[PDB]
Design a protein around this nucleic acid. Structure first.
Lengths: 117, 205, 59, 122, 138
RNA sequence: GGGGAGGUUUGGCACCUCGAUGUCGGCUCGUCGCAUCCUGGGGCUGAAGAAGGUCCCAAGGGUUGGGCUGUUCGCCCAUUAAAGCGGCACGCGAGCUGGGUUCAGAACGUCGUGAGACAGUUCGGUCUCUAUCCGCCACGGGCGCAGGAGGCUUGAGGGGGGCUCUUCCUAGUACGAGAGGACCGGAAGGGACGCACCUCUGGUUUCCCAGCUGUCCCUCCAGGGGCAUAAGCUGGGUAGCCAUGUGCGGAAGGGAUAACCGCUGAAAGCAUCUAAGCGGGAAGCCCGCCCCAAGAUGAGGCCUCCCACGGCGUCAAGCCGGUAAGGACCCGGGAAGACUACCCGGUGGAUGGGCCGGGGGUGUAAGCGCCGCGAGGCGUUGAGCCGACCGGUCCCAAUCGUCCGAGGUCU
RNA sequence: ACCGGAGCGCUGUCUCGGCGAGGGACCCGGUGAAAUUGAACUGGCCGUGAAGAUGCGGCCUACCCGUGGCAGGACGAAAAGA
RNA sequence: GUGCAAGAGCACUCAGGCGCGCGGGAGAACCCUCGCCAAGGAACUCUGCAAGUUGGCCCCGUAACUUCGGGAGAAGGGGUGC
RNA sequence: CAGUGGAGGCCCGAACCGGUGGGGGAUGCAAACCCCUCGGAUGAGCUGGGGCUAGGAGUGAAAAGCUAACCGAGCCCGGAGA
RNA sequence: GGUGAAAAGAACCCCGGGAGGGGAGUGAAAUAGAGCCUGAAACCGUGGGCUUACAAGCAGUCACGGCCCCGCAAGGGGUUGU
C-alpha cells in the first residue's frame, strides 16, 4: 500500500525543498504566478504555512522563514506589508487556479497563485 | 446463527483477567433491519441491515422508505444476514453477550499488484552469487515440452489487495451499549473505520 | 533484434484492433458566466474569466 | 531466536564454558528455540581440569538470550547474551553451580532445579 | 461514532493515574509478579530504565538493570499487572530518551553521565510537608 | 525351474531434428503416478502386553537442518511420527547458477623418432536489455441479457484448505515371573503450514527532532543557509509498510463406501459376511468452511422507481430529436489503484490544503539575565519546533454548468 | 591482484526476507526503429502422424478487442552445424 | 584560496564554466544503483564471489624463521576535539 | 657503536601507465564502454616528433599473438567466368 | 531521362508566419501545374452495399437460405447465415 500517507515528488529531496523555496520566493515578491497544477498544490500548502508564521512577529519565526528563504528586504516586506494585511486571515492566504491551453510542447495542467485579499 | 453489522475501531491489549488481550473494537451501532426474505419468493431466509443515518437529497427515489416502515436509509447502505429472523426493531449490538466467540466478514485493505514473494509466497534467491537479474522473481513456471502449457492457476504474480475475507473463532469479552461497541480478540481484517459484519461462529453446530 | 522476434507477420485487421481500442478522445467545454464563450470546466479564460476575472488584457 | 550455528556460553561448573548450538528437540522443522528450550550442543570451549571436555556433544536448556520473550501479560525480559545450561540424555542439570539471573519461564517448563539455586529469578 | 480516539479514550477505565513521575534516566524500586503454581508473589524489580514509548492507553517503559550475572532489560505495560511499582530517585538531565549507548559501555560512565536535577528533589522537600500544610489548608 | 508386467537403469534400432533439438547437477516453480517413507484402518502372525515381522485398502497432507564431494549417488552429524521411490527432453539456461563439461594457453604424468595426440589429471577462460502469436495471473473498453434507473441477492460450476508431535488422567489398574507396560474416553501445551492484522515486541520514516565535522555565504558576533548522495555523519524516531510480532484456519457433524468386520439366508436338509435384504467401518469420496462467481448467451431471483404519439413506419420491425427514474462529463479526493476501473464528497459542503486543539515525535532551543580569563555552564524550560495522525474550523481550492438518458417487440 | 585447508573478528551470503530511495518501468503531449515475417480466422485433452499438433480424427473451454505482467510452447529468433 | 601529516589526494569553494537538445505527471509488480535491520553469525555458496569490519598521523608492542636485508603497519592495544 | 650521508629493476600512493575479482551494460554512451576494487608506481619505466624492418616475409619476455576493428599467412588488382 | 507544339511556366483577390491552397488567368488539354506524359501492383486512406459481439479456423469449396444492386422475361452479380 504505497503512497498510503501522502506527499508529491519528482526531483531530489534536496532539489525539491529548494524548488518549493524558490517558488515561495518569486511568489512573495509578486503574488499572482503561473506554474503547473501539482506544483501549485503542494506549493500553496507550503507557502501558506510560511505566511501563517509571518502572521506572528517573533525573531524565531522571522529567521526560520528566512532560513528557508533568502533576501533580507524580503523579510522586511514580509513583516511590514504582506503579513500585516493577512493579519485577520487565518488560512489559505494564497489561491491557485487552473488555466486553458496546457503547457505547450508536452501539454500540462497549468494554474496561478494569488495574494487573495 | 445471528449477526450484526459494524465499523472497525480500536485494537490494543486491555489487561482483562490479569493477562493481556489484543482488543479489536467494532461499532455495530444502530444497524437497521428493514426487510426479510421468505422461501417461495426468495429461496432462503435473510434480512437487510442498514447503518449510519446521514442521507437526504443525495439518495432519494425508492428509498424503501417505502418498504413498509421507512426510517430512511443510512449512508453506508445495507447488507444481508442469512438464517436470521429477528424480532423487528433495528438491532443494536448486544445481540452478542460478552463471553461468546464469533465469525466476522470484511474487506481487506489494498496492496494491489505485488511481487510474488509478497503475494502467495515464492523465494527468489541469488542476491549475490548468481545474478542480480532475478531477485524478486518467480524463476520457472511449467514443464518442458509436455504439457508445453502453463498450468491453470499455477500461482503467479499479480493482485493481492482489494479483496474480502471472513475470519472465524474470535472472542468478544466486552460490549458497550452506551455508545455501541464490541470488544473482541484482535485479528481484525481491513483498515480502521470501514465495512465489517459480525455473525455467530461455528464449532459443532 | 533480441530474443523476442515477431513470429510471422501481424495482420492488417489486427493492427486495426490494437488501434480500435486506441482511437481519439473528445474534449469538453462549458459556458462562461459574465462572458460569451467556452472554457474547460472550473477554469478561467483570457476571453471570459472566473469570478472577478483577472488578466483579460487580450488585444 | 535461537538457531543452529549459534555460539552459547554455559553458566555453571559443568566442566565447560562455551558451547555451539546444534539442532533443537522440537518438531522436525522447529528450527527455533528460546526460554526453557531443549537444545543439542557441540562443546567448543571448556576449562581443562573439568568433566565435559573441549568438543563434547551433550544437551542443554536456554535460560538467557539476546531476543527477549513476551510474557502473556505483555511484560518482556532480556539477559544480554546466549547463556544456556547443560542437560543430559536424561533431562538433568549436570553440574551444581548456577550463575546469574534466570527465567521463571523455565519454571513452568520442568526445570525446577534451575529456579531453585537460581539467584535472581525473572 | 467518528472520533475513534474518543472510543479508545472511553476505554479509559483502565488507567494508572497513581504513580511516581520519572524521566528516561534512572527510576529503580519494585514491581509486581506471579511465581508459583498459584501466583502469590510480587518480585521487586529496581532498574535504571531506558525507554519511554508513549501511546496514551498503554505507554510502556523499558527498564535496564544489571544484576548478579549481567545486564537485564525488562519492559513494563504501564497499566495493570505492575501493582505499585514505585521508583527510587528518578534522576535525569538526559538528552535523548533512548539510552542504547549504555548497553555498550555500562560502567562508571553511567555514573559519569547522570546527575539528578536538584530542583526535582527541591519540590520533593517542598511537597513533603506542604502536604501536611495541605492537610491543614482548604 | 516356469509365466507376466513396468519403461526409472544399463543396451539393440537409426525414423522427426546436422540451413541447430544448448548435453551435468543446484537455485527457483512445481504437477501428477502409487508397486506408500510417515500419518488412518484392517486381516494374519513363530502377536501376553509393549513394540515388531508381513500382506491388503488408502495420496488427504507431509516428507526437516548441516559436514564432505561440481557431483544427482552415497557416507556422516544433529534430529523426526517420518526423512518415500518415479515421470514429465532423466521437468524447468528466451527463468537463474556456469561450479562440472569436450575450444584455442600452459603444465603435469603419458604415448608418440616427431608435429601433436590420450573416458588420465590440473589452472585460468564473453548465457545475446524491448514477448508477435498460444498459455497462465491481474485489469479494463464494446456489446450483450428481446422496456428503461438504482439497490440487495441466488449459487451453476470451480478454486483454495484438509497436517501433526510430546505431556499429564483413567492406572501403574489388564496382561505379565518380573522388567516392562494397554486399549476407551478425557485434559494440556508444541512445531510445521494457510489467513488476516499494528494492539504489545521489534526494523522501518528522503528532512519529523537533535548533536557534529571541514567549509563557503547571509552579517564581524551569535545566529542561519547549501555542499558533502542521488539525507554529508551519527544518535533517535509518529503514522503508513511489515515479521520474529499478533488473533484465528485445519475442525467438530452429516451422507455414501473401500480393504475388511458383521446379521437373518438359501441354492446344495448342514455351512457361508451375499446371489434378495440390513449394520459397522478409513487422514481417503460428497458435504459441512473460506473465496470467486448469472458472458449459469440459460444472462436467472428479490426490494422498489419512471413512463406513451413527440416526427417519417397507417396496417409489419425500425428510424429520429429532446426528456421521467437517472447516468455521465469536470473537479476535492481515497488504508483504492500500473492506466482504467471500485469507493466517497462537491457549498444544503468538512473532500484537500491553511488554521486551532489533541496525541505523538524529539528533548530545556532562538534570545534574555547570571558565573569561569576561557571552552562552556546555572537558570528562564520539559521549551521550541513539529511528515503522514484523532478531530474542530468554509479561511482558500470543489464556481458556473455541459451532455447521454424510457416513448415501453410479439405469441 | 596466481589453485586448495583452517582460524578469529565482521557483516543481510544465508534463516528470510521488511520498509525506504532516486532513476527507468506505468498515464498525457513531441519525434519515433530494429531483427522476424508463406498466409492466418492461432484455446485444452486423448490418440494419431516421417514418431513432439489450435491446423488430422475422435474429443474438449469458452461473447468482441485490448492494458500491465510471467515465461511452458510455437521443435521460439541469430548460426546454409564448429 | 581553507582544512587533514603533508601534497597535482580529498570535501567546500576562488576565478572561470556548466546544468549535459524532450518533458510532465503520477509515486504499480519488476529492474538499476543506493541506505537501516531485529535475534542467529558463513548455517549461503562450487568459493566468504559479493558486500561489509578494518581505516590517517604520534605513542606502546611483535612469533617461527632467515640468505641478517626482512619477515613488520606482523598481530594486540592506546590516543586524537576544544 | 654513534652521527652523518641518501643508495635502490625499494616500500604506501596521484597525474601516467595497465586491466585483476565482481556488478552493469549486450540492436549499448560504445564494432570492449562504465562503476566498484585492483597491480606498477626511479625504472626491463612511461611519453610527443622524425625514421626503418612486410606476406612465406617481417615483429615477436613466445599465443602461431601484431602487421590497419576478422592473421594458421594481411589488403588490393589480375590469370578467373579457377 | 522526357511540362507543352510554344513559357504562354499562373498577374489579381482570398485563408495562412510561411508552407500550401480556393477562384481568377494560360492554352486543344492544368486529370499537361513545374524532377510535371502515359500512372500496374504491393501500399495506407474515404464514402457507401452485404455480414459479424454462444464463437473451433490451409479460410475455401458445393448446396440451401435471406439482404442489396442489375435484367423485358427467364437469367445474373455483389454478400454470407447454415
Amino acid at each position: 500500500r504505497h503512497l498510503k500517507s501522502g506527499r508529491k515528488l519528482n526531483r531530489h529531496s534536496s532539489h525539491r525543498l529548494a524548488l518549493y523555496r524558490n517558488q515561495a520566493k518569486s511568489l512573495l515578491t509578486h503574488g499572482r504566478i503561473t506554474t503547473t497544477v501539482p506544483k501549485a498544490k503542494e506549493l500553496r500548502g507550503f507557502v501558506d504555512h510560511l505566511i501563517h508564521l509571518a502572521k506572528r512577529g517573533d525573531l524565531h519565526a522571522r529567521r526560520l522563514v528566512l532560513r528557508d528563504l533568502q533576501d533580507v528586504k524580503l523579510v522586511r516586506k514580509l513583516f511590514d506589508e504582506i503579513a500585516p494585511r493577512y493579519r485577520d486571515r487565518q488560512g489559505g492566504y494564497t489561491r491557485v487556479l487552473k488555466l486553458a491551453e496546457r503547457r505547450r510542447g508536452d501539454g500540462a495542467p497549468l494554474a496561478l497563485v494569488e495574494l487573495v485579499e | 446463527m445471528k449477526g450484526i453489522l459494524g465499523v472497525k475501531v480500536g485494537m490494543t491489549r486491555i489487561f482483562r483477567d490479569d493477562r493481556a488481550v489484543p482488543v479489536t473494537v467494532i461499532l455495530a451501532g444502530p444497524c437497521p433491519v428493514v426487510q426479510r426474505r421468505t422461501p417461495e419468493k426468495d429461496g432462503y431466509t435473510a434480512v437487510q441491515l442498514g447503518f449510519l443515518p446521514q442521507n437526504p437529497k443525495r439518495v432519494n427515489r425508492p428509498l424503501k422508505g417505502h418498504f413498509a416502515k421507512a426510517g430512511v436509509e443510512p449512508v453506508r447502505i445495507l447488507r444481508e444476514i442469512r438464517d436470521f429472523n429477528p424480532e423487528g426493531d433495528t438491532v443494536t449490538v448486544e445481540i452478542f453477550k460478552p463471553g461468546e466467540r464469533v465469525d466476522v466478514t470484511g474487506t481487506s485493505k489494498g496492496r494491489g499488484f505485488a511481487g510474488v514473494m509478497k503475494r502467495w509466497n515464492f523465494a527468489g534467491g541469488p542476491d549475490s552469487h548468481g545474478a542480480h537479474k532475478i531477485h524478486r522473481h518467480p524463476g520457472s513456471i511449467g514443464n518442458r515440452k509436455t504439457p508445453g502449457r502453463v498450468y491453470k492457476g499455477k500461482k503467479m504474480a499479480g493482485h493481492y489487495g482489494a479483496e474480502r475475507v471472513t475470519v472465524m473463532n474470535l472472542e468478544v469479552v466486552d460490549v458497550i451499549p452506551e455508545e455501541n461497541l464490541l470488544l473482541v480478540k484482535g485479528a481484525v481484517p481491513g483498515p480502521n473505520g470501514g465495512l465489517v459484519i459480525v455473525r455467530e461462529t461455528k464449532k459443532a453446530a | 533484434a533480441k530474443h523476442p522476434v515477431p513470429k510471422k507477420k501481424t495482420s492488417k485487421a489486427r493492427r486495426d484492433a490494437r488501434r480500435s481500442h486506441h482511437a481519439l478522445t473528445p474534449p469538453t467545454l462549458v459556458p462562461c458566466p459574465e462572458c460569451k464563450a467556452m472554457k474547460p470546466p472550473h477554469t478561467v479564460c483570457p476571453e471570459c474569466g472566473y469570478y472577478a476575472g483577472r488578466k483579460v488584457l487580450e488585444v | 531466536m535461537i538457531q543452529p550455528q549459534t555460539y552459547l556460553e554455559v553458566a555453571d561448573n559443568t566442566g565447560a564454558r562455551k558451547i555451539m548450538c546444534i539442532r533443537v528437540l522440537k518438531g522436525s522443522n522447529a528450527k527455533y528455540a528460546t526460554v526453557g528450550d531443549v537444545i543439542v550442543a557441540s562443546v567448543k570451549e571448556a576449562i581443562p581440569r573439568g568433566a565435559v571436555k573441549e568438543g563434547d556433544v551433550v544437551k542443554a536448556v536456554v535460560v538467557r538470550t539476546k531476543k527477549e520473550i513476551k510474557r502473556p501479560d505483555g511484560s518482556a525480559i532480556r539477559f544480554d547474551d546466549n547463556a544456556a545450561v547443560i542437560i543430559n540424555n536424561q533431562l538433568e542439570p549436570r553440574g551444581t553451580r548456577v550463575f546469574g539471573p534466570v527465567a521463571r519461564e523455565l519454571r513452568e517448563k520442568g526445570f525446577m532445579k534451575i529456579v531453585s539455586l537460581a539467584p535472581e529469578v525473572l | 461514532m467518528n472520533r475513534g480516539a474518543l472510543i479508545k479514550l472511553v476505554e479509559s477505565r483502565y488507567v494508572r493515574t497513581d504513580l511516581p513521575e520519572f524521566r528516561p534516566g534512572d527510576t529503580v524500586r519494585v514491581s509486581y509478579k506471579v511465581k508459583e503454581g498459584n501466583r502469590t508473589r510480587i518480585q521487586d524489580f529496581e532498574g535504571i530504565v531506558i525507554r519511554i514509548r508513549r501511546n496514551g492507553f498503554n505507554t510502556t517503559f523499558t527498564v535496564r538493570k544489571v544484576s548478579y550475572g549481567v545486564g537485564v532489560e525488562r519492559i513494563f505495560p504501564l497499566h495493570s499487572p505492575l501493582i505499585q511499582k514505585i521508583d527510587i530517585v528518578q534522576r535525569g538531565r538526559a538528552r535523548r530518551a533512548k539510552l542504547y549507548f549504555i548497553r555498550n559501555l555500562s560502567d562508571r560512565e553511567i555514573r559519569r553521565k547522570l546527575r539528578a536535577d536538584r530542583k526535582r528533589i527541591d519540590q520533593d522537600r517542598a511537597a513533603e510537608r506542604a502536604a501536611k500544610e495541605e492537610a491543614q489548608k482548604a
